[PDB]
Amino acid sequence: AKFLKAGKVAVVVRGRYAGKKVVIVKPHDEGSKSHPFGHALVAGIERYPLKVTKKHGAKKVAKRTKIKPFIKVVNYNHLLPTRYTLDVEAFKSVVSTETFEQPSQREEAKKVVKKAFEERHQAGKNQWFFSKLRF
Amino acid sequence: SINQKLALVIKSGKYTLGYKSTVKSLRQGKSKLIIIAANTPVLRKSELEYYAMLSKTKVYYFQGGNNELGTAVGKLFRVGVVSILEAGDSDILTTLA
Amino acid sequence: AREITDIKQFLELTRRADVKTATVKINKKLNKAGKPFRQTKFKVRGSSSLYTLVINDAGKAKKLIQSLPPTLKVNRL
Amino acid sequence: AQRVTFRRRNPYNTRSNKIKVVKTPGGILRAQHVKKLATRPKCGDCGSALQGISTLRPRQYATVSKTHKTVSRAYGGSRCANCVKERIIRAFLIEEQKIVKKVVKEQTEAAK
Amino acid sequence: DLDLASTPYKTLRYHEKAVRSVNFHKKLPLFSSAADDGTIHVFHATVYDDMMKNPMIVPLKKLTGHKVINSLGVLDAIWHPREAWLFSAGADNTARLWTT
RNA sequence: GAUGGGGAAGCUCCGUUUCAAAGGCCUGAUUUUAUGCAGGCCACCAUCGAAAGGGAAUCCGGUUAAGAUUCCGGAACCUGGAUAUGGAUUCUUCACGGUAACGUAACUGAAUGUGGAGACGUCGGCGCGAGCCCUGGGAGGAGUUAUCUUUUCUUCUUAAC
RNA sequence: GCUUGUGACGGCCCGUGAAAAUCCACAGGAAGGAAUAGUUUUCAUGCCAGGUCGUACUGAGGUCUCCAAG
Incomplete structure (x- = not known):
């Protein structure tokens, strides 16, 4: 079964975001004219939302829940596919092949992605995805 | 014997050899049965077991080293992991092995 | 010693007011294999290191010596 | 002479x-x-000359920028990218073996 | 300036999105700047050849009206060879000509 | 080899972390019977011992009766310290590209944990570089020559950074 | 070719190959950071300073050592 799907969590293995968790928004099983290899389109999050205690208030809480995202075309060979899954429907039409290679379409991709991840972190759900992969 | 079961498939049906190609096959879901040698690295063994768990593939541990798996496929070199893309004239899937 | 292949950069250095003297060095060199020409070398004792300016052209040299601040002490060769 | x-x-x-x-x-x-x-800086996990790091005298590293002393990944200026890869894989699967062991432990307790 | 330094002589950071295309006019001392916000800014730039005097750059007009199609503005801009007219090209499937 | 200890009538010897109270840092609205200091973090041990071991950074030309990597001219580098400006830190709050190895003018990172350099046996052949040696042409000078000899000798240099 | 420097290999061992000062790096996530100069200077440019002692010469059955033309 083709497990590498549109709602699939993965762990990036290589390059600047090594160790950082991602979600494959749109797979490309047999590549393209740019990227001639089985790759995936991902949108993961770089700066993890930091821990928040009852001592933190009003401004620190706003600072901790702030997440910084990233978008990258990544090879399957540098992906570790995970058993876990994540909702993706909010940003499927936002990231495509046209989204990549021509900014500032990447910028407005990053803003919708930033929104989606921050709105999902608040109202505490999918907590495993926003925890730091300890290695 | 397993050697009789495998050598038939290697002369009749579609197959693959080694780590990288088996993992590519698991990604495509075109793998049906994977064969893991005994002396394979623990990290690569765990990575194949987990990938097969994702793709929902039946897993067979070959009793003996990679040399004996190369001998089983009838090749001079050594092979750590063999997949079955297409099962041959043998009923290898429905059997215990 | 550091090469600057950059004209106005040298002129910025000359008006630093921490610079006392300058020097214009004249050379006799040949191109490719054919003909001899005349090379100039605009050198200032900078703040830390000496900056130098190879200008293979003679007209740009003719313009640059003219374009220097008149209060600055200029040295031939 | x-x-x-x-x-x-x-x-x-x-x-x-x-x-x-x-x-x-x-x-x-x-x-x-x-x-x-000067010698190459080396992989702490691997034992190999790690790429992209400047080769200087020990004291000479103080003068040069951070972009000559570090590559951009996690464990960048200290590991291999192969030895980082290997510990991403390892820490993931060890962390998931913990889950499976909790599943077996919770099942055996319910059996008793 | 290829005479002044290796750094930029003047850094100007005004655009809202990615500065997609910047082009000189051939005859008149003018240059444009078409970013991804559907906006072209036109600049006057005097260059003084003989005298050791740094080039003056002044802004002129913010040209607008271009439609933004999925976070994408003006993909290209090219000047007319001999007069101060400018050819734009947006994501709105439409090229435009600007006039004095 | 002191210190703590323990011997010794003693001069002094044993011992080098030992059953030593061996000390140096952080937190705080000022510490609630009213202006008397509370809580925490870390657990080995002074020192001497190398002008051949490890070690920040200097070269060239010149100069005296006798001094030179030390003096002079020129040109450098290292280390420590205040601080000043430009640039960055993006619509305001710690930057991005590359599938990837990685790249960048920057791109905060405390306690604590770790890694590299320092930092390392000996030989063999092979590759590459620098100096020396051999040599062709050419630009100068000294020589020998009755004979033969486009002859013999010498100069043709390039430091740190 | 000689001198010397360096690179990748291959032998020789259960012989697995001084220490420390000093310098750098990673993991970590404490703290800090804006509306008459926010936080940060491992980016660029600019400023100042660097004490004591040795330093001459010789060094040739009879102490050690370096350079080495045809």
Whole structure:
């Protein structure tokens, strides 16, 4: 079964975001004219939302829940596919092949992605995805 | 014997050899049965077991080293992991092995 | 010693007011294999290191010596 | 055919006292004391010359920018990218073996 | 300036999105700047050849009206060879000509 | 080899972390019977011992009756310290590209944990570089020559950074 | 070719190959950071300073050591 799907969590293995968790928004099983290899389109999050205690208030809480995202075309060979899954429907039409290679379409991709991840972190759900992969 | 079961498939049906190609096959879901040698690295063994768990593939541990798996496929070199893309004239899937 | 292949950069250095003297060095060199020409070398004792300016052209040299601040002490060769 | 003397006070052929015979602009040969050569920084996990890091004297690393002392990944300036890869894989699967062991433990407790 | 330094002589950071295309006019001392916000800014730039005097750059007009199609503005801009007219090209499937 | 200890009538010897109270840092609205200091973090041990071991950074030309990597001219580099400006830190709050190895003018990172350099046996052949040696042409000078000899000798240099 | 420097290999061992000062790096996530100069200077440019002692010469059955033309 083709497990590498549109709602699939993965762990990036290589390059600047090594160790950082991602979600494959749109797979490309047999590549393209740019990227001639089985790759995936991902949108993961770089700066993890930091821990928040009852001592933190009003401004620190706003600072901790702030997440910084990233978008990258990544090879399957540098992906570790995970058993876990994540909702993706909010940003499927936002990231495509046209989204990549021509900014500032990447910028407005990053803003919708930033929104989606921050709105999902608040109202505490999918907590495993926003925890730091300890290695 | 397993050697009789495998050598038939290697002369009749579609197959693959080694780590990288088996993992590519698991990604495509075109793998049906994977064969893991005994002396394979623990990290690569765990990575194949987990990938097969994702793709929902039946897993067979070959009793003996990679040399004996190369001998089983009838090749001079050594092979750590063999997949079955297409099962041959043998009923290898429905059997215990 | 550091090469600057950059004209106005040298002129910025000359008006630093921490610079006392300058020097214009004249050379006799040949191109490719054919003909001899005349090379100039605009050198200032900078703040830390000496900056130098190879200008293979003679007209740009003719313009640059003219374009220097008149209060600055200029040295031939 | 000029013969060449040591320049510093050590008259001996130690590790520190290497000689390069260099021709000077006075038209004469003279010795130059060779600085002890810089080595590659190495993988703490691997034992291999890690790529993209400048090769300098230990003290000489203080002068140079951080982009010559670190590659951009996690464990960048200290590991291999292969040894980082291997510990991403390892820490993931160990963390998931913990889950499976909790599943088995919770099942056995329910059985008793 | 290829005479002044290796750094930029003047850094100007005004655009809202990615500065997609910047082009000189051939005859008149003018240059444009078409970013991804559907906006072209036109600049006057005097260059003084003989005298050791740094080039003056002044802004002129913010040209607008271009439609933004999925976070994408003006993909290209090219000047007319001999007069001060400018050819734009947006994501709105439409090229435009600007006039004095 | 002191210190703590323990011997010794003693001069002094044993011992080098030992059953030593061996000390140096952080937190705080000022510490609630009213202006008397509370809580925490870390657990080995002074020192001497190398002008051949490890070690930040200097070269060239010149100069005296006798001094030179020390003096002079020129040109450098290292280390420590205040601080000043430009640039960055993006619509305001710690930057991005590359599938990837990685790249960048920057791109905060405390306690604590770790890694690299320092930092390392000996030989063999092979590759590459520098100096020396051999040599062709050419630009100068000294020589020998009755004979033969485009002859013999010498100069033609390039430091740190 | 000689001198010397360096690179990749291959032998020789259960012989697995001084220490420390000093310098750098990673993991970590404490703290800090804006509306008459926010936080940060491992980016560029600019400023100042660097004490004591040795330093001459010789060094040739009879102490050690370096350079080495045809």
